[PDB]
C-alpha cells in the first residue's frame, strides 16, 4: 500500500509517496535523488524520533490510512554538513489571516 | 431531449450513497422535468422501484453540488438479470471545491463583501443547479 509523505527540512518540503513495506534507508535514497545528499549525510525523523535505516515505513507508523494523499504524514529531515548533524529544524508554514467578518 | 422513456417495464434498483453528502435523487420525468425524491443520508442505501430507460441524476441535497453515479452523471435502470447505483463524490476541481467551502460559510448577500477579483463574485453566485446542468445537449 502507498503512503503519502512530506519530507521536510528548514524551508524545503518534498511531496512523495512510498510503499508501507519500503525502508527508511530507501526513503533516504529518494531524498538523495532529489536534494543530492547521500544517505549517510541524512537523518530522518518521525516527530522527534530518529528513524533507523532498516525499519519499514509501516513499522515507523506511516500507514496508508494515516499518510493520506490529501493529508500526508511529515518526515523530518536533517543533514550532516561535514562533521556533526545539524539539529532537526522545520520552519512552519505561514499563518492564515483572521477569518473575515463574513464567515 | 433528456427524458425518461415510458417503458412501463419495472426495473428494481438500489441507490447506494457512498459519499459523505446527503444525496437528493432526481428523476427526469417523461416531459424532462426534474422530480426530487426522498434524500439519502451518507453511507446509507435504499431499494427503489424504477423502470427500464428511466433517467436519474444525483445531487447534494443541501447545495446541489453534482455527484457521480456508477462513475457518470446519469443512471439509467436496465434489465434485471436489482441494479446497483453507486453514488460517489467526483474529484472536484480545486476551484469548484473552494467555491463549495466558501458558499458554505458566507451568506449569498455577502459574496460582494469579500476581497477577491470580480470574476470570482460571479463564480460564487453561479451556484450549482440541476436546471443549468440539464442544458448541454
Amino acid at each position: 500500500m502507498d503512503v503519502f509523505l512530506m519530507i521536510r527540512r528548514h524551508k524545503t518540503t518534498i511531496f512523495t509517496d512510498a510503499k508501507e513495506s519500503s525502508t527508511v534507508f530507501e526513503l533516504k535514497r529518494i531524498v538523495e535523488g532529489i536534494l543530492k545528499r547521500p544517505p549517510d549525510e541524512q537523518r530522518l525523523y518521525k516527530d522527534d524520533q530518529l528513524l533507523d535505516d532498516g525499519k519499514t515505513l509501516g513499522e515507523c507508523g506511516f500507514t496508508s490510512q494515516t499518510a493520506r494523499p490529501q493529508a500526508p504524514a511529515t518526515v523530518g529531515l536533517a543533514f550532516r554538513a561535514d562533521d556533526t548533524f545539524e539539529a532537526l529544524c522545520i520552519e512552519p508554514f505561514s499563518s492564515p489571516p483572521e477569518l473575515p467578518d463574513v464567515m | 431531449v433528456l427524458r425518461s422513456v415510458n417503458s412501463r417495464e419495472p426495473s428494481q434498483v438500489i441507490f447506494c450513497n457512498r459519499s459523505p453528502r446527503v444525496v437528493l435523487p432526481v428523476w427526469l420525468n417523461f416531459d424532462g422535468e426534474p422530480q426530487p425524491y426522498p434524500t439519502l443520508p451518507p453511507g446509507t442505501g435504499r431499494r427503489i422501484h424504477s423502470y427500464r430507460g428511466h433517467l436519474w441524476l444525483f445531487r447534494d441535497a443541501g447545495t446541489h453540488d453534482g455527484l457521480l453515479v456508477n462513475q457518470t452523471e446519469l443512471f439509467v435502470p436496465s434489465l434485471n438479470v436489482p441494479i446497483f447505483a453507486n453514488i460517489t463524490l467526483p474529484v472536484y476541481t480545486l476551484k469548484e471545491r473552494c467555491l463549495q467551502v466558501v458558499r458554505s460559510l458566507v451568506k449569498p448577500e455577502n459574496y460582494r463583501r469579500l476581497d477577491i477579483v470580480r470574476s470570482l463574485y460571479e463564480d460564487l453566485e453561479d451556484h450549482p443547479n440541476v436546471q443549468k446542468d440539464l442544458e448541454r445537449l
Binding site: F15, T16, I34, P72, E91, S94, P96 | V91, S119
Partner: protein
C-alpha cells in the same frame, strides 16, 4: 522528474513534474524546473500540492473517494490561487 514551487514567503515545495503540469498555468510558467509565486503563501501552496496528489490518486478510481478538506481560515486564499492556476 521533480519541479520546485516556491511560495511568497520562501518555502520551497518539491513535487513530481507530472503532478505540477496538472495546472496549465504552471506548465506555462515552466515552459526551468523552478517556479516562484510572489502571491501565494506557503499555507496555501502546500494545500495546492496536496490537491495534486489527491487528484492524481483518485481520478479514474471506482472505489470510494474521500472529501478534499479545506479549513475555513484558508478557503478564501486557496480559492484565489485555484482561480489563478486554473486548478
Amino acid at each position: 522528474m521533480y519541479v520546485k514551487l516556491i511560495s511568497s514567503d520562501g518555502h520551497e515545495f518539491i513535487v513530481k513534474r507530472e503532478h505540477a503540469l496538472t495546472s496549465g498555468t504552471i506548465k506555462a510558467m515552466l515552459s526551468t524546473n523552478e517556479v516562484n509565486f510572489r502571491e501565494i503563501p506557503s499555507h496555501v501552496l502546500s494545500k495546492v500540492c496536496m490537491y495534486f496528489t489527491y487528484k492524481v490518486r483518485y481520478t479514474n478510481s471506482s472505489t470510494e473517494i474521500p472529501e478534499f478538506p479545506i479549513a475555513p481560515e484558508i478557503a478564501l486564499e486557496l480559492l484565489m490561487a485555484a482561480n489563478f492556476l486554473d486548478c
